[PDB]
C-alpha cells in the first residue's frame, strides 16, 4: 500500500522541485528584458541583439516546453489520484498552478517590443555612424579649400595697377567666381548632413552644428567679400579707362599743335631780302594773315590745356596712383606753354622788323622819284640848248656880231643852270649809297646827263670860238 | 715889233705847259681804270665805287673842258698867226695836237664798262652776303635739332616691352614721324641756299657744300633709321598680340576644365550607403556614364596643352622677353596635369569600391532568398500538422488507442522535422549579422516560425496527454 505512496510522492515532489525551478527564471529574466538602455556605438548595440538571439533561440524555448510539461504533471497526478482516491495536492502557495499563467504572461510582457527596439537602434546607429563620417569628411575638404581665401580676397593689389593689369585681375576674378559657385552645393550638403544628424539625436549634434554654422557664416562673408572685389576692380577699370582716354586725346592734339608752334617760330624768323615796295608788302600781307590765325591758335592751346586739367583732376579726386605723365606723348603741358610764349614774343619782333624794311623801301622810292623828276627836266633842257646853239647862225641882220651876242647869252644860261646838274649828281650819290640801282621813273641815268652836259659846255666853247675866227678872218 | 712877239710866245708856251699837263693825266689814269681786280666784302667793294664817283664827277669833267680848251688854243694861235703872217707852231712831237684825240680815246677805252663791273659786283656780294648768313643760320638750327636723334632712334627699349608699352611707343613714334616730315622742307632749302651760293662763286662754297652734304647724308640715314623702328615696333606688337591671344585662350579654357577635374575628384570619393542591389546599381550606372566622358575629357586636356605649347614656342623662336607665365590665369599647365592624373588614379579605386558593395548586396540577397525558401516551406508544414492533430479524434474504429497511435506518429514526424527549424534559425543569424532586416521573399520572419513551432510542440504534448487521461477515465 505505501509502496505506491512512495512514487506518488516523487510524482508530486517532482512538481515542486521543478515548478519552482521555473518560477525563479521568469523572475531573473523579466528584469533583463524590460531594460532598453541604449548603447554607444552600433557594433556594441548589435552584440546586444546577439544576446537576445541566444536567449529567444536556445534559452527561452526549453522553458516554454517546461511550462507545458508542468500542468501536464498537474494532471497525470490529478486525474491519477482520482483513480486511487485520496484528494490530490495543490502545492506551495508560493508556486501556484494557475498563476504560472501570469508569471509567464509577465515575461511575455517585458519582452514585448524588445527586438523591435534593438533593431531600430541598430538602424539609427547605422545611418548615424555614416553621416557623422561623411560630415567630418565633406567639411574637412571644404575648410581646407577655404583657408586663406578671405584674406587674399581683401588684398588691394589693384590700386597701383594699370588698365591692363586690373583688366587681367578682373578676368582672373572671373575664374574665382566660377570656382566659387562650384562649391555652392558642397556647402548645402554639409548643412543637410548636420541637419539629419540632429533629427537622429546624434550625440555630438552640438559640435557638428557649430562647425557647420561657422562654415555657413564664412560662406556668406565670402560671398559678399567676393562681390566687393568685382566692384572695386570694375571701378578701377572705369577710372583708368577714363584717364587713358584723356591722355590719348591730349597726345593726339599736342603733337600737331607742337608742330605748328615750331613751324611758326621758324617763319617769324626767316631772313628775307627785298628791293621794291611791292616785295616787302607781300611779306607784310603774309605776316598779317599769319597773325590772323593766332586767335584760334590760342583756342586750341587752351582747349588742350583743358584736357590735361581733367586728367590731373580725376586722378586727384580718387587719390589714385599712376603718374599724371602721359604714356602716349612726349611734350609736356608746361613746355607747351613756353613754346607758345615764344611764338608770341616773336610776333612784335617780326613786324617791327617788317616795319623797318617798308620804311627803307619807301625811303628808296623817294630817292628814285626825286632823281627822276630832276633828270626828266635837265635832260630836255640840255637837248633844247643844243638846238638853240645849233641855230644862232640865222640872224635877220647878217651873222657874226649878232650871232655872238646870242652865243654869249646861251653861255650865261648854261652857267646859270649848273646848280641843277650839281643837285642831280648829289641825289645820284644818295641813290647809290642806298644800294638802289634801278629807277623806272626816268630813262636818264646820271651818266647820260653827264655826257650831255659835258657835250653842251664843249659845243658853246667851240662855237663861240669858231665865230671869233669868223669875225677875224673877215673883219 | 718884238712887243707882240713877247705874248705870241706866252700864247704858244701856254699850249705846251698845259697840253703836257693833260697828257700825263690820261697817263696816270688809264691804269687806275682797266684794273677790275675784285674785292673781299661788299662794304669794301662799294667804297671802290665811291672812288669812281669822285672821279667821274669832280675829277674827269674839268679835264674834258681842258681837252677842249686846247685845240681852241691851237686855233686862237693858228688862224691868229695868219693875221700877222709868220708860220705857226705844231709843238713838241711828244705832245701831238691831233693825237690827244687818241690819248683820250685811250682813257675812254679803259673806262669802258668799269662802273658796269663795280655795280654787278656790289650786287653779287649783295645776294652772296645774304645767302651765306641765311645758310649759316638755317643750317645751325637744323644741326641742333638733329643732335642725338639718330642715337635715340637706335635704342631698343621695345624688346622687354608689353603689348601696351610697345603700342604706346608706336604711337609716340607717330609723333616723331610727323615732326620728321615737318622739317623735310628746311633740308631742301639748306640745299638750295648752298646751291645758289655756288652759282655765285661764293668764296667758301667748298665748306658750305660739305656742311650741306653731311646734312643731306644724315637726313637719309635718319629717314631709313626711322623706318627700321616702325617695322620693329610693328613687328613686336604683332608677336605680343599673338602671345596674348594664346594666353587668353588658354585661360578661358583651363578654368572650366579645372573646375571639372575638381568636381570629378569629389564625385569619385563621395561616401555612399545602400541596402539593395538596385541602389548600388544606380551608383554603378552613374559611374559608368561618368567614365564615358573621360575620353573627350582627355581630348580637351591635350587640346589645352596644345595652346600652351604654341605660346612657349613662338616666344622661344624669337628669343623674346615676357615670362611665358599667363597673366590671365592662375592654374599652370604642370599642375593641370597632376590633377588629371589624380582623377585617373581615382577611377580604378572607385569602381573597385563600387564592386565590393555590389558583391555585398548580392551576398545579402542570397541570404534573403535562402531564408525565404525555407520559411515558406516550414510555415505551411507546421500549419498542416496542427490540422492533422486537430483531427485524429475521428478513427473508423472508435477513438483512443487508434487516436493515440496516430498522435505518436505525428510526434515522430515533428521530432524528425526539427533540423529544419534549426537550419532556419541559423540562416536567420546570418541575415542579422549582415545587417539585413528586410526580406520581401517571404511573409514569415524567424519569430512567426518560432511561435508556430513552439505551439506545435505544446499542442501534441497536450493532446497526447488528454488522450492518456481518456484511455484511463474510461479504461
- Selected for mutation to probe chain A from B84, B171, B252, B433 (highest A CB count within 10 Å) is B171
Give the DSSP letter string of B204-271. THHHHHHHHHHHHHHHHHHHHHHHHHHHHHHHHHHHHHHHHHHHHHHHHHHHHHHHHHHHHHHHTT--
Of B81, B80, B234, residue with least CA distance to B167 = B234
The set of cell numbers assigned to A277 is 615796295
- What is the experimental method? X-ray
Min distance A158 CA to chain B CA atoms (Å) = 14
Give me the sign of the Cα torsion angle B319, B320, B321, B327. negative
Min distance B447 CA to chain A CA atoms (Å) = 9
CB A240 within 8 A of CB A166: yes
**Cβ atoms within 10 Å of B367's Cβ, excluding its own:** 19
| Angle between helix A205-267 and A114-146 (nearest 10) | 20
Give the DSSP letter string of B369-426. HHHHHHHHHHHHHHHHHHHHHHS-S-TTTTSTHHHHHHHHHHHHHHHHHHHHHHHHHH
Find where cell 583756342 sits.
A299
| Angle between helix A277-316 and A333-390 (nearest 10) | 170
Min distance B122 CA to chain A CA atoms (Å) = 8
Min distance B243 CA to chain A CA atoms (Å) = 15
Of A107, A122, A2, residue with least CA distance to A56 = A107
Residue B200: strand, helix, or coil: coil
Of A426, A434, A452, A448, residue with least CA distance to A371 = A426
Of B79, B171, B327, the CB nearest to A328: B171
Of B66, B465, B428, residue with least CA distance to A54 = B428
The set of cell numbers assigned to B337 is 596635369
Q: What fold characterizes domain A242-361? A: Methane Monooxygenase Hydroxylase; Chain G, domain 1 (1.20.58)
Helix (H) or strand (E) holding B328: none
The set of cell numbers assigned to B362 is 548580392
Give the separation between CA B415 and CA B456, rounded to whole angstroms.
11
Q: What is the 8-class DSSP label of residue B93?
A: G
The set of cell numbers assigned to A59 is 534559452
**Cβ atoms within 10 Å of A68's Cβ, excluding its own:** 17
Q: Does A83 lie at the interface with B, CB-CB under 8 angstroms? A: yes
Q: What is the 8-class DSSP label of residue A95?
A: G
The set of cell numbers assigned to A125 is 546607429
CB B383 within 8 A of CB B455: no
Of A137, A162, A174, the CB nearest to B271: A137
CB A192 within 8 A of CB A134: no
Find where cell 532556419 sits.
B424
The set of cell numbers assigned to A356 is 623797318
Cβ within 8 Å, pair A65-B255: no
Of A115, A178, A462, the CB nearest to B68: A462
Longest dimension (CA), chain A: 253
C-alpha R_g of chain A: 72
Residue B151: strand, helix, or coil: helix
Alpha-carbon dihedral B441, B446, B449, B453, rounded to 10 degrees: 150
Cβ within 8 Å, pair B76-A432: no
Of A165, A2, A251, residue with least CA distance to B173 = A251
Q: What is the 8-class DSSP label of residue A157?
A: G
Q: What is the 8-class DSSP label of residue A59?
A: I
CATH class of A1-126: mainly alpha
The set of cell numbers assigned to A12 is 508530486
Of B295, B445, B313, residue with least CA distance to B379 = B445
Cβ within 8 Å, pair A437-B171: no
Cβ within 8 Å, pair A256-B178: yes
Give the separation between CA A455 and CA A450, rounded to whole angstroms.
8
The set of cell numbers assigned to B290 is 561618368
Q: Does A64 lie at the interface with B, CB-CB under 8 angstroms? A: yes
Min distance A198 CA to chain B CA atoms (Å) = 19
CATH class of A127-241: mainly alpha
Q: What share of chain B is helix, strand, coil (3-state, %, to 5)?
A: 80, 0, 20
Q: Does A48 lie at the interface with B, CB-CB under 8 angstroms? A: no
Q: Would you kindly state where each structural domain of chain A is located, as residue ranges?
A: 1-126, 127-241, 242-361, 362-475
CB A322 within 8 A of CB A240: yes
CB B170 within 8 A of CB B234: yes
> What residues contact residue B173 under an 8 Å CB cut-off, 6+ apart?
B229, B230, B233
Burial of A169 (0-12, 13-18, 19+ CB in 10 A): buried
Burial of B266 (0-12, 13-18, 19+ CB in 10 A): middle
Find where cell 546586444 sits.
A48
For domain B362-475, the question of CATH label 1.10.10.10 is answered with no
Of A64, A172, A458, the CB nearest to B329: A172
Give me the sign of the Cα torsion angle A97, A98, A99, A102. positive
Of A70, A19, A16, residue with least CA distance to B465 = A70
Give me the sign of the Cα torsion angle A273, A277, A279, A285. positive
Count Cα atoms within 13 angstroms, Cβ side, for B126: 16
> What residues contact residue A87 under an 8 Å CB cut-off, 6+ apart?
A81
Residue B112: strand, helix, or coil: coil
Burial of A334 (0-12, 13-18, 19+ CB in 10 A): exposed
How many CB pairs (< 8 A) connect A and B? 156
Q: What is the 8-class DSSP label of residue B81?
A: T
Residue B37: strand, helix, or coil: coil
**Cβ atoms within 10 Å of A284's Cβ, excluding its own:** 15
| Domains B242-361 and B362-475 agree in fold | yes
Q: What is the 8-class DSSP label of residue B364?
A: H
Nearest residue of chain A to residue B134 (CA atoms) = A271
Question: Where do the DSSP E strands lie in A230-317?
Answer: none
CB B74 within 8 A of CB B97: yes
| Angle between helix B114-146 and B163-199 (nearest 10) | 170
Give the separation between CA A412 and CA B107, rounded to whole angstroms.
31
Of B240, B345, B359, residue with least CA distance to B294 = B345
Q: List the alpha helices (DSSP H) in A24-78.
A: 25-32, 47-54, 60-76
Burial of A15 (0-12, 13-18, 19+ CB in 10 A): buried
CB B357 within 8 A of CB B284: no
Of A357, A258, A436, residue with least CA distance to B175 = A258
Cβ within 8 Å, pair B64-A469: no
Amino acid at each position: 500500500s505505501s509502496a505506491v505512496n512512495q512514487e506518488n510522492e516523487r510524482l508530486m515532489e517532482e512538481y515542486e522541485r521543478l515548478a519552482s525551478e521555473l518560477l525563479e527564471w521568469i523572475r531573473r529574466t523579466i528584469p533583463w528584458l524590460e531594460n532598453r538602455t541604449p548603447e554607444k556605438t552600433m557594433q556594441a548595440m548589435q552584440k546586444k541583439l546577439e544576446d537576445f538571439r541566444d536567449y529567444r533561440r536556445k534559452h527561452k524555448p526549453p522553458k516554454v516546453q517546461e511550462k507545458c510539461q508542468l500542468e501536464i504533471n498537474f494532471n497525470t497526478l490529478q486525474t491519477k489520484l482520482r483513480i486511487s482516491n485520496r484528494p490530490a495536492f495543490m502545492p506551495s502557495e508560493g508556486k501556484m498552478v494557475s498563476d504560472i499563467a501570469g508569471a509567464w504572461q509577465r515575461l511575455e510582457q517585458a519582452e514585448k517590443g524588445y527586438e523591435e527596439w534593438l533593431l531600430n537602434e541598430i538602424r539609427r546607429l547605422e545611418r548615424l555612424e555614416h553621416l557623422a563620417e561623411k560630415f567630418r569628411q565633406k567639411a574637412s575638404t571644404h575648410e581646407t579649400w577655404a583657408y586663406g581665401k578671405e584674406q587674399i580676397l581683401l588684398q588691394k593689389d589693384y590700386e597701383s595697377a594699370s588698365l591692363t593689369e586690373v583688366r587681367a585681375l578682373l578676368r582672373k576674378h572671373e575664374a574665382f567666381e566660377s570656382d566659387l559657385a562650384a562649391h555652392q552645393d558642397r556647402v548645402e550638403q554639409i548643412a543637410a548632413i548636420a541637419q539629419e544628424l540632429n533629427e537622429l539625436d546624434y550625440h555630438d549634434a552640438v559640435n557638428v552644428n557649430d562647425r557647420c554654422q561657422k562654415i555657413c557664416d564664412q560662406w556668406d562673408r565670402l560671398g559678399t567679400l567676393t562681390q566687393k572685389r568685382r566692384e572695386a576692380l570694375e571701378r578701377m577699370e572705369k577710372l583708368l579707362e577714363t584717364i587713358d582716354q584723356l591722355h590719348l586725346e591730349f597726345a593726339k592734339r599736342a603733337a600737331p599743335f607742337n608742330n605748328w608752334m615750331e613751324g611758326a617760330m621758324e617763319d617769324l624768323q626767316d631772313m628775307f631780302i627785298v628791293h621794291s615796295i611791292e616785295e616787302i608788302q607781300s611779306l607784310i600781307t603774309a605776316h598779317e594773315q599769319f597773325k590772323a590765325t593766332l586767335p584760334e591758335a590760342d583756342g586750341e592751346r587752351q582747349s588742350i590745356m583743358a584736357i590735361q586739367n581733367e586728367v590731373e583732376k580725376v586722378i586727384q579726386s580718387y587719390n589714385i596712383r599712376i603718374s599724371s605723365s602721359n604714356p602716349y606723348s612726349t611734350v609736356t603741358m608746361d613746355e607747351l606753354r613756353t613754346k607758345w610764349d615764344k611764338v608770341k614774343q616773336l610776333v612784335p619782333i617780326r613786324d617791327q622788323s617788317l616795319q623797318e624794311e617798308l620804311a627803307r623801301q619807301h625811303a628808296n622810292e623817294r630817292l628814285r622819284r626825286q632823281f627822276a623828276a630832276q633828270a626828266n627836266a635837265i635832260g630836255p633842257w640840255i637837248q633844247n640848248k643844243m638846238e638853240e646853239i645849233a641855230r644862232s647862225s640865222i640872224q635877220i641882220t647878217g651873222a657874226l656880231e649878232d650871232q655872238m651876242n646870242q652865243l654869249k647869252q646861251y653861255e650865261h644860261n648854261i652857267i646859270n643852270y649848273k646848280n641843277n646838274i650839281d643837285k642831280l649828281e648829289g641825289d645820284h650819290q644818295l641813290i647809290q649809297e642806298a644800294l638802289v640801282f634801278d629807277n623806272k621813273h626816268t630813262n636818264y641815268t646820271m651818266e647820260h646827263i653827264r655826257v650831255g652836259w659835258e657835250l653842251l659846255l664843249t659845243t658853246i666853247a667851240r662855237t663861240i670860238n669858231e665865230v671869233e675866227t669868223q669875225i677875224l678872218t673877215r673883219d
